[PDB]
Design a protein around this ligand. Structure first.
Ligand SMILES: *[C@@H]1O[C@H](CO)[C@@H](O[C@@H]2O[C@H](CO)[C@@H](O[C@@H]3O[C@H](CO)[C@@H](O)[C@H](O)[C@@H]3O)[C@H](O)[C@H]2NC(C)=O)[C@H](O)[C@H]1NC(C)=O
Ligand SMILES: *[C@@H]1O[C@H](CO)[C@@H](O)[C@H](O)[C@H]1NC(C)=O
Lengths: 148, 49, 49
């Protein structure tokens, strides 16, 4: 997504590399469909069963990519919408996010997993959504931010 | 509510799920009385949000 | 897809119908893509062998 943007923003363009990346983005998009939950969220293995839960960090990585490869081409909205309902549920009144981890490996995430940056990256990618900077949710985030 | 500092207001606030909309409203707080607010909501863009 | 164009011409649409049918387009697109031949033709069982 951010390579295509890097070429598109710098005017380093060409069409059939977009057809290339179209095969790419479609197969990957539905690959993520291979491991979500019908509540909406995303963990390592997922589909065909309910014996698992999603992931703050990874589903944030997911939804940032949603928003930007949405920001070039067609998307459908209800899915990522219910993903937002999930993320909305999962944080305290006055405290931070929970790394409800069902991850894969140790250094996939280049961040060292502080609760600090856990909760921050969640909320601020959630802001990197086409969404407000006003919602009570992210205010609870900002409370955690001042805390952090 | 009850107990120590009814200098309080409970609330059933409302911030929706995509874009921006809200139904902010306030509700009193006096001790150990079950005074039940009757708030309300109007229609939306989409049917079942 | 055929009723999609049908809707688009008959003029009676409810657009989130087509957003989730856009879901149908790309998901059938790719879950059919994962079963083709290396050449371009198609078989029934195929992929991974
Ligand atoms: C490269 O960047 C652009 C953003 O600048 C990506 O979005 C495409 O931008 C063009 C305009 O440059 C859009 O065309 C416009 O569409 C609207 C209706 O949506 C219409 O009202 C305007 O008159 C104009 O025709 C285009 O829709 C939009 N996406 C595409 C091409 O479908 C573009 O996707 C990026 N291309 C890549 C991936 O390199
Ligand atoms: C939400 O915030 C946006 C900011 O531009 C504003 O335009 C819009 O009217 C607001 N919607 C409501 C009704 O809260």
């Amino acid at each position: 997504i951010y390579v295509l943007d890097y070429l598109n923003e710098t005017q380093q363009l060409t069409p059939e590399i977009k057809s290339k990346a179209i095969g790419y983005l479609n197969t990957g998009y539905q690959r993520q469909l291979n491991y979500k939950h019908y509540d909406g969220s995303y963990s390592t293995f997922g589909e065909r069963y309910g014996r698992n839960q999603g992931n703050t960090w990874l589903t944030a990585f997911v939804l940032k990519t949603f928003a930007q490869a949405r920001a070039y081409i067609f998307i459908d909205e209800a899915h990522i919408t219910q993903a937002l309902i999930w993320l909305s549920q999962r944080q305290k009144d006055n405290g931070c996010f929970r790394s409800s981890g069902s991850l894969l490996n140790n250094a996939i995430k280049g961040g060292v997993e502080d609760e600090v940056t856990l909760s921050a990256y969640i909320t601020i990618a959630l802001l990197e959504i086409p969404l407000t900077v006003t919602h009570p949710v992210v205010r609870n985030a900002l409370f955690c931010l001042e805390s952090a | 509510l009850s107990y120590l500092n009814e200098t309080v207001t409970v609330s059933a606030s409302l911030e929706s799920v995509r874009g921006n909309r809200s139904l902010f409203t306030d509700l009193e707080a006096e001790n150990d009385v079950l005074h039940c607010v009757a708030f309300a909501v109007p229609k939306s863009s989409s049917n079942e949000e």
